[PDB]
Ligand binder design. Structure first.
Ligand SMILES: O=N[O-]
Ligand SMILES: [Cu+2]
Ligand SMILES: [Cu+2]
Length: 259
């Protein structure tokens, strides 16, 4: 509730105290050195099957907002790419900055983007998300960078509900949202084994990071920056800079799906 966040006193440099895996061997995010990632011809195209996605709700959970999905059947699934089996979409959320020069979690040759989107999926062979996060191949997260330029139409429905979930713990019905509207044109990706980027930082994630950023407008990101980390009736702290910086790559190889 205040033991981890992104403030001066509970930010990413502090998380290892409650979550020692923060200094682990497969932590995320990382800097993607484009000259050192190796093309792997064995990597298959990613299969994003979001046609039957059922969004249910949007929740300000105090660190970001999550758009949640019905995951009791195979409705919105990620397959292929580096993955074995079927991974069901459970939620997506973003990380963003106070200024356009920062906000993403992953970086590319040290470049920081203005924000980053994460679509979170779990492996169905484990039956539920809570069991899946306990497995090294339990989750697959699709990461997408945001830059400031032209507006992203498929984001505006998210932007316009944010006034109704300004503060922590507020939720709003959020049915019939189509996550395909947040994807860039190309599904070229880098992939590496990593972790959740918020506590509990479990090392259960196959990361799939798209090379092509999406563009959003200055006004859209300005509305993200009006959210609050705090609950209603508490001192206003703008929800900005909710990103973990790049972590050591250690004994990992980032593979590229492209030449
Ligand atoms: O928030 N990333 O798992
Ligand atoms: Cu806390
Ligand atoms: Cu995330």
């Amino acid at each position: 509730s205040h033991h981890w966040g992104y403030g001066k006193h509970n930010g990413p440099e502090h998380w290892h105290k409650d979550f020692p895996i923060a200094k682990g061997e497969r932590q995320s995010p990382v800097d993607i050195d484009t000259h050192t990632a190796k093309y792997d011809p064995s990597l298959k195209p990613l299969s994003v099957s979001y046609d039957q996605a059922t969004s249910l709700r949007i929740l300000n959970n105090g660190h970001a907002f999550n758009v949640e999905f019905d995951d009791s059947q195979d409705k919105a699934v990620l397959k292929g790419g580096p993955l074995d089996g079927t991974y069901r979409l459970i939620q997506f959320h973003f990380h963003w900055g106070s200024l356009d020069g920062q906000g993403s979690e992953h970086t590319v040759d040290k470049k920081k983007y203005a924000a980053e989107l994460h679509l979170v999926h779990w492996n169905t062979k484990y039956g539920d998300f809570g069991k899946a996060v306990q497995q090294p191949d339990g989750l697959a997260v699709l990461g997408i960078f945001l830059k400031v330029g032209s507006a992203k139409p498929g984001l505006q429905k998210v932007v316009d509900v944010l006034d109704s979930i300004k503060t922590k713990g507020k939720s709003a019905d959020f049915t019939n949202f189509d996550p395909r509207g947040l994807l860039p044109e190309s599904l070229d990706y880098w992939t590496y084994p990593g972790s959740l980027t918020t506590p509990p930082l479990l090392e259960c994630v196959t990361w799939i990071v798209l090379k092509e950023p999406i563009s959003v407008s200055s006004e859209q990101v300005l509305k993200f920056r009006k959210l609050n980390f705090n609950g209603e009736g508490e001192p206003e702290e703008l929800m900005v800079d909710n990103w973990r910086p790049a972590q050591p790559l250690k004994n990992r190889q980032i593979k590229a799906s492209f030449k």
